[PDB]
Amino acid sequence: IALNPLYRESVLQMMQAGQRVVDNPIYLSDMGAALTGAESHELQDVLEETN
């Protein structure tokens, strides 16, 4: 978000790791992977993984 700004950076300051409000780490990883420009197929493949 500093070297390739796409969306606002306020959401990361609202949702911080020091607030203990990350009840769902999976959502944080999905939100971080959604910012990627990786092709959709690859995203589906990432969802296919079980571990």
């Binding site: 020091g18 607030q19 203990r20 409000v21």
Partner: peptide, 30 residues
Amino acid sequence: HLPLIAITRNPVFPRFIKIIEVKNKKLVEL
């Protein structure tokens, strides 16, 4: 003799200026 403040996930390291943003408004009265 005042009630404890609601730190609410905010560490204040010794000799380190820090900022606190509690969500409650009952602390604004105190």
